[PDB]
Amino acid sequence: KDIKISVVVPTYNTELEGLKNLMASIDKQTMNPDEYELVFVDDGSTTDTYERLQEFAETRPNMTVKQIENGSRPRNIATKMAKGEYILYLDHDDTVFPETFERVYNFGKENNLDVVSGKEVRTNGWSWGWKQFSENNPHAEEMGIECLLPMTPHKFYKREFLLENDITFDDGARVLWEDVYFNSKAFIHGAKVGILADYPTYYWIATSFGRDPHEKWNQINKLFNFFKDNIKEQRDLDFMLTHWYRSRVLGILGQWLLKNNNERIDIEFNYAKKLAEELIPAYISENLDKNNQVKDYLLRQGDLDSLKKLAQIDAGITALSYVEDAYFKEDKLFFKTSTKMTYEDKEDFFIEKTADRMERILPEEIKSKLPKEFFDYSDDLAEFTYEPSIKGRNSRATWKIDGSTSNVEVVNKKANLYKIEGEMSFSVQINDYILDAADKKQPWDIATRFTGLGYTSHRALTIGKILIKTALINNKTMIVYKNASGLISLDVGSSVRSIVEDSGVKREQILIDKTSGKVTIPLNEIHVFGESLIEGNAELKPVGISDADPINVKAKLIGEANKARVEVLLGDEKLSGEYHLVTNIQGKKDKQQIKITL
Template sequence: MTAPALKVSVVIATYRSGAGLDRLVASLDAQTLPTAEWEALFVDDGSGPETLARLESLAAERANWRVIPLEHSGWPSKPRNVGVEHARGEYVSFMDHDDELFPDGLRAAYSFAKRNRADILNGKESHTTAVSWAMTQYRENADNIRGQVDPFPVAPMNPHKMYRTEFLRTNGIKFHEGSRVLYEDNLFNLEALSRASVISTMADVPYYHWVRDGSTTGSSTFRRDPAEFFGSLERVLRATQEFLSEPSDAALRDAAISYQHRLRFAGHFNAAWARRSPSVRQREIELITPLIAEFIPERLDATLPRRLQAKMHLFRAGEWDALTSLAVIEDQLDPHHKLESVVPGDDGGLDITTRSVWRTPEGDPMRLEVRDGRFIRRLPDEIRSLLPAELLDITDDLRASHLAIAGRISSPLSTWAFPGSTELVSQDSEAGHEAVFLTRGRFDPATAQLGHPATPGMWDLGVDAVFLGSASQRRIAVPPDVRAAQLRLGSRDSYLVAGSDKGKLAISVDVPWHVSNAFSRGFAISPMPGGRARLTFPHVTSAADGVDGVTITLLPRRVASFAKRRRHVMRRVLERLWPAPSRPLQVSPSGAEITVPRRLFRSGRMLFVTLGGASPRQPLGIHVGTRDGEIKRLPAG
């Protein structure tokens, strides 16, 4: 067999690509794997001359890029299959045309896959808006999880993975083609799972960023048609039975069906479903009922958390009104994480303790009774009377809840859980007993990213939680009396930023200046050679954001010193200096930036930064120079 000419072929299915393509191109240009060792194949699905000319122009400037034009097929499946046919790499990596790879993604993923002779490499994936996305999947590296059932080996079931090219070709594994083939990625991964011998998980190096910016995609539209949605799920369930039909795969087959059951059948009965009209709910029940009867035996309900088991009990009993009411009650609970303590350790770490509860929007706790050391749910009588007693006992699910202190770095966007422990306690409330979790974790900049050093920048600290089978991640709330502080964590300069964003906890690692942000959108400052500094605004990604310039207002030292003690004086001074000249921003898909003299940030000075035409009373953020290692912070307004 002839050795592959390249290590990796990156296959990108394109169709009328928009601004997101610039983000993808920038991420490919930033790869640490030498360009002589990989290629990018842009397989265009008949976009037309404008997109094709754009792609060809990009490829003309890069020797390892190729463009393959196709007639319009209507779905990414055919372009991906054609990409595999043309691939010269030992491994093939699929990308959507508006996503991005992390800079070391290709190098690290190929090295990990090659070392394990993996057929499939599942690399750490981040999601723009779902902070807790796939965190249970990427808790640790694994050489081979082919026989694993929890978490499911190829979850998440999208194609953002690395596959051995010859493995796909030899087994004839292809995406199902057509003008609209929903869940084609599920079908592809199920077949790949059934044929694979080695499936590796790479969790310690970020690989893929699934960008969700609110734009509509084909895969986000089909839930509008219940018949199409559940018809597609039927196809996935039949494929599961077909591809995992061997007796040796019985446990894996059950795990695959339970995966769909938890997410798209039992999990379908949520508050959003309850808000639909009675006629729509009834239509969906009519579509779901035969699928559950054929594919999901009652014994698989036991693999679900008790809260979902209760819903399935009501569903199988035909108690639709009670099911609707329970769906509303379940989805009202939101996590609240409060900082209990934060203490620098002697060995360079930061010990963090939080107290976590789940409550309704009105602040009411989940109602519990404690009987003989067991936690029993208190539900309305009309629901409680329809459920067997064992489904009201959620003790085991509470004890199985997994909470960990976690940090999210915005550039490059990724989330990391830190080592620690969780303790389940209870406390009395007016409604009875309430489940409370004390979570302890250690943030160590030397090992924060699964043994790797923390990326310099601002880390938002939260709690990654799997509570009663439901995953979430929320920021840690900071009590008003907690102040900002400069820390020396090992060899890293760090700044603990208390209440940096709506009273939430963050820590800045190796960033000498921090700018607080009054509106949940901040900016970073980093030094540059030649006495310059760069201000970066990650949330400004295109001219459509309505921002074309930045106003920087510098207060003299004496005025700043007085203004810090007299907030009304600070506002008046700022208005007197308004309007200041606007400086143009360089806007790109990865954010906007401007370079300014570093002398602006000398100790003791105060700097106001305002984007676009914002009011002088509402600056984006305030930077106060540091002196004697202390951070001074003032909220805007």
């Protein structure tokens, strides 16, 4: 049988019980176990890293171990002895999602891809690979080298392709951004790259060399020289220069100046200036945004003092979205939101209209040093974006929410000052983001992404007033709410909140049918769509007694004809008197103080 996928098992921490933890994520793959293999490699003592090593290997038929006569050179030997069509270089503590192997191989084989850039998930943040992991693209390499961004080493690589172009991790010295070098060489050698965006493939879990400014800028110089000497297509070289110049070199001329001591600032500033002069052509800054053109111009002038002042003037610019309306309709959750650019969610962010120019507000001393074009936002006032996103609080996967309509205008607030105001409406069909069984019961967090004038604000949606709205939709309990942090969350499956408590109870419409032993408890405020039956139980306690033992009984939450109710089955009980009733639906109890008389 042909091997479809070979996973290179890491040995950074080769604790045997740690390899036990790793097989859990891999044994849950939907792919047949005999169509993938696990490739291990070590160089240790006779027992705790070798004898109990192959003891574990003789149990797994698809596991292989081999020694080395000496953490990257191990990866090269694993690549050569592997037999799978694609190779995954799995890092420690990282996990893959249950359908990754099947979906990656099908996608790569059908489209004959040398690299499958699968959607990657990180613990923190509201996005990862926002631009690239939007839609599936089986012909991504035609877009240029940026199709491989973000250049993590967590993609699926065609094994034949790596061996035929001798694409390996750097043999000796520990190098920064070896994944950048690796994925760049893959593209340089004409890799067919496909982007798999509709299913998360890799979970990069969150868990020193290069902190030295001298080694840091030594490594930055190496990376830029690697680009200059190895990239042959000018379009691709221009992108890599522009991308890394903006983020690493110019990326220290903003708020980084306000966070480091003056002694380290002086060192890294001269490093950045020398690199810009020796390595970055002048035309590169021409395709940059206005704020970075300012940074580039002041860098080449060596004007560190102006840059320190501009960092002070720019600190805290952001855009936080407020919920203006939220409701359930049909089987979806609808949102209306508003936003505006501010300083730290407080006073408005302003630009200034002087004549035909929409000017960045700067002191006169700095305005006189800059070319006029670099603080005129006139040409950029129609390039605002405003989109919604969502994140599973357990899976950590983030997704753009499609189908939104937005509007951003430049509004004259007072005198010649102008603010930037945005509005947006969108809906959530939660089934769009339920891909694994575990996603069915999960809290979800909503965010908004706002970009414009060189700034990007991707922040959690918030509301000030208490919002609690519930829904019973096709056997899914849904609760949208202002969570404990003041941010918008959608609880599905009662993982945090009780839908009965949040919906309230019409305690005066409670029905008791003693012949059929059925108690009916109608819910008050709740959107009910489709038919729903969710089984649970309830507790009865006699009213007068203290510390009374509970009477356990079955119960069910029913959605029917756009109305919801809990029916409690008394069964054999045969009771008399007044009892407290507490419903327990999906593990959550209500605090509605229900009393019934039997």
